[PDB]
């Protein structure tokens, strides 16, 4: 997988520093940023347990949109079932601190970009945050970064027929990082091995 130190260096290389709050566990409080773009990488587990899975949250203060990009695109019920993760409190806190009307639009990905056995979740979150820092009104799709990868229905995550698309996404992710991150370039072989497409495949 990816450690926090790795993800912070790569998000800084991709130009997201001006908006990046850092890496957090499931207790990420939410956004206190009524007038500034902001984003964060958040784990589904608590720091006590050790990391489990990475997601990215991002906030556009002009449209009052809170984006959630979790690389498998699970539904809210599946996030609670699979990872015991819920994010109602951070949405509530974000709306009360950051919008005079106490309302926001939540826009969340509903497709998987990551293979079921891949350990590249944190790297996909970095890639989405480059998309957000440059296209904060359309980060999920229809932008030069996200056009390199292709989501598939989360209900088809384990089906053979979507694997080539998910493997192509992983290849495009690593190539994107080679062109934009000196830190990834200098740790290329190591990060590709620790995050590989079938890193977690059953034996």
């Amino acid at each position: 997988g990816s450690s926090e130190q790795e993800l912070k260096a790569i998000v800084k290389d991709l130009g997201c520093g001006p908006y990046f709050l850092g890496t957090y566990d499931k207790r990420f409080p939410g956004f206190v940023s009524p007038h500034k773009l902001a984003c964060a990488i958040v784990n589904t587990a608590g720091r006590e347990t050790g990391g489990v899975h990475w997601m990215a949250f991002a906030w556009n203060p002009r449209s009052k949109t809170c984006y959630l990009f979790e690389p498998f695109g699970f539904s809210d019920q599946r996030l609670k079932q699979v990872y015991q993760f819920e994010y109602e409190s951070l949405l509530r806190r974000s709306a009360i601190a950051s919008s005079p009307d106490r309302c926001i639009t939540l826009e969340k990905s509903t497709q998987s970009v990551q293979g079921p056995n891949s350990a590249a979740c944190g790297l996909f979150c970095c890639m989405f945050l480059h998309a957000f820092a440059n296209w904060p009104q359309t980060p999920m799709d229809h932008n030069p970064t996200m056009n390199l990868i292709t989501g598939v229905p989360n209900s088809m995550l384990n089906s053979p027929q979507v694997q080539p698309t998910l493997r192509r996404n992983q290849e495009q992710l690593y190539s994107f990082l080679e062109r934009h991150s000196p830190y990834f370039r200098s740790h290329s072989a190591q990060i590709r091995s620790a995050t590989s497409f079938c890193h977690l495949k059953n034996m």
Binding site: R102, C103, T105, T110, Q111, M140, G151
Partner: peptide, 11 residues
Amino acid sequence: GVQSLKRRRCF
């Protein structure tokens, strides 16, 4: 990229 769902949430 990915398709997404939008939901308005007020508190």
